[PDB]
């Protein structure tokens, strides 16, 4: 029951649903990261804000994919959202490392989807991901920049460096 | 590891975590409801908007609970988010009925939490839910109003009534 | 006699000329659809406006293709514009069905052209269609949405439903 | 001699007078803390400002309680204000620890008063404390956040950390 579907493979439709799940899972992970840094015994507001902003971005990405699914005449199918991989996230450095791992996995899923689109001769999908692809590269570059600065600040005054990074790099 | 926790029972802490899960689940359900009404073979924009707005409201509720959890020195614990109970939601009437069922369950969970707060002599919790409690009563009243209007419009021109309700009651 | 042509195949050049013809033909079809709904014995202004707007959009598309043809050093070649397939277009539903058929055919021609561009290793063409491709998907989604609403409104009060759709969905 | 008193127990009236004393004592303690950090041999302006702001807040709280006492037809009774527990307050960390101890004691007194109100079936009192209760939870969370940051900054460059916290966290 679609009267509009054209050149939209069942393979891409399913891959888009899986990507929505991955984006929502990422959003959930960032929600957990954000609130961890808001704990009174962690108390790094710039870090909390950074991850809460990412939770919003990932949710927005999922919503864009869902809009596209309907635009193409595919059917959204939702699965459980697995809880994030940790309950406590360690240091800012630990968290930023986890975030980059997460983003690399999202990026790989985008790359896999683009490849499927190319194999299926689906240029609209290709065009649509173009939005996701650059945004992801920009985000990963930012995270790498952050990680380098966090790492430079460890030294052997780790608490001091963690405070200074949150105060002087992150938005608060 | 909290230096601030005071008069905040482990029972309430756990109940707050469960309530966060219920709110996030509700948000997820509303996301699914919203996109269903955006299908080209359903195509009721006012209904899509209504449920997408509710998805945002429920997410906001979860975020408020998480902020409060940290304010009190409790620790957020996240669980899986179960997928919504249906993949396709039927008519506007079916959907509005499902929504009221969902809201009644959230309201009951709020009532249960307030009762626990009262049993634990936790007035801050009581005060905090006061926000949730009125918002929920207002929302359920609105949904009941909608259901009555949807029901009046069935008659034996169901398609006509569904169109008119979306056009003339819902925001588009 | 071009001093600029580079990586622009004769196959793509010809396909672009054919696409210009298809867009102009579509524009002509929409002109006819628009004026049919302006007949005193049809008199559905929102429908007239919808199709007249599409006539303008298709003409604009042809003009964009012609601009691109010259940008690449190809040579515009015009053919006859075949008259639209009907002189009278029936109900709003009949017309919207005809419109979606027309758009699917344009979309297929765009897809065919992108495939040719990919086969000819012509990335500028690919980039250029990216504009056409999303606009077409958006338009077809809109038409599918319209068709669903028109269909819901037939019931057995067809005149009533046709009036209400024109009044409450379409711009007038 | 009141013509307005209704449902206002002598127990609550007395507890309100004691709470006014506790708030005024807290204000006095914060006055002392503030001026200590303004000493030329301490010289941490952000810390001075933080505690002077709290002195004002506590005085305001006492004034609100006194207004409520009269609104209910109770009679304000003032006792001596005991001098603060220290003449010199040590490091920012020492001071912030003392402040949280002080706030926990105020919060416990508020909780005790709410419990008395509930036992006496005095809902206006309950409503009134609702203002005090959330403000106190917010303040204690802030103090806990501060303490965590101060503690992270000790390291073995304590002077450096104390300076940086005052410069980069506190308002100056
Ligand atoms: Pd924070
Ligand atoms: Pd934040
Ligand atoms: Pd919609
Ligand atoms: Pd919407
Ligand atoms: Pd007209
Ligand atoms: Pd017109
Ligand atoms: Pd000063
Ligand atoms: Pd000051």
Curated annotation (Swiss-Prot), chains A, B, C, D:
Keywords on this record? Acetylation, Cytoplasm, Cytoplasmic vesicle, Iron, Iron storage, Lysosome, Metal-binding
Residues the record lists as binding Fe cation: 53, 56-57, 60, 63
| PROSITE patterns reported in the protein's UniProt record | FERRITIN_1, FERRITIN_2, FERRITIN_LIKE
N-acetylserine is found on: 1
Question: Transmembrane region positions?
Answer: none
Q: Name one GO cellular component term.
A: cytoplasm
Which GO MF terms does the UniProt record name? ferric iron binding; ferrous iron binding; iron ion binding
Cellular location(s)? Cytoplasmic vesicle, Autophagosome; Cytoplasm; Autolysosome
Q: Name one GO biological process term.
A: intracellular iron ion homeostasis
Q: Where does the record place the region Catalytic site for iron oxidation?
A: 53-60
Positions of the Ferritin-like diiron domain: 6-154
Cytoplasm among the record's keywords?
yes
Question: Which Pfam families does this UniProt record tie to the protein?
Answer: Ferritin (PF00210)
Q: Does the keyword Iron apply?
A: yes
Matching CDD domains: Ferritin (cd00904)
Report the superkingdom from the record. Eukaryota
Q: How does it assemble?
A: Oligomer of 24 subunits. There are two types of subunits: L (light) chain and H (heavy) chain. The major chain can be light or heavy, depending on the species and tissue type. The functional molecule forms a roughly spherical shell with a diameter of 12 nm and contains a central cavity into which the insoluble mineral iron core is deposited. Interacts with NCOA4.
- Do you know which PANTHER family this protein is assigned to? FERRITIN, FERRITIN LIGHT CHAIN
Q: Which family does it belong to?
A: Belongs to the ferritin family.
Q: What else is known?
A: In horse spleen the light chain is the major chain.
- What is the stated purpose of this protein? Stores iron in a soluble, non-toxic, readily available form. Important for iron homeostasis. Iron is taken up in the ferrous form and deposited as ferric hydroxides after oxidation. Also plays a role in delivery of iron to cells. Mediates iron uptake in capsule cells of the developing kidney. Delivery to lysosomes by the cargo receptor NCOA4 for autophagic degradation and release or iron.
Q: What is this protein called?
A: Ferritin light chain
């Amino acid at each position: 029951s679609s009267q509009i579907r054209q050149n939209y493979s069942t393979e891409v439709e399913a891959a888009v649903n899986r990507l929505v799940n991955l984006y929502l899972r990422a959003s959930y992970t960032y929600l957990s990261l954000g609130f961890y840094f808001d704990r009174d015994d962690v108390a790094l507001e710039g870090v909390c804000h950074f991850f809460r902003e990412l939770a919003e971005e990932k949710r927005e990405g999922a919503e864009r994919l869902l809009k596209m699914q309907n635009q193409r005449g595919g059917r959204a199918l939702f699965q459980d959202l697995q809880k994030p991989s940790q309950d406590e996230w360690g240091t800012t450095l630990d968290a930023m490392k986890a975030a980059i791992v997460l983003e690399k996995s999202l990026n790989q899923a985008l790359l896999d989807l683009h490849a499927l689109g190319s194999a299926q001769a689906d240029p609209h999908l290709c065009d649509f991901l173009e939005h996701f692809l650059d945004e992801e590269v920009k985000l990963i570059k930012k995270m790498g920049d952050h990680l380098t600065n966090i790492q430079r600040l460890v030294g052997s005054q780790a608490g001091l460096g963690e405070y200074l990074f949150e105060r002087l790099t992150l938005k608060h």
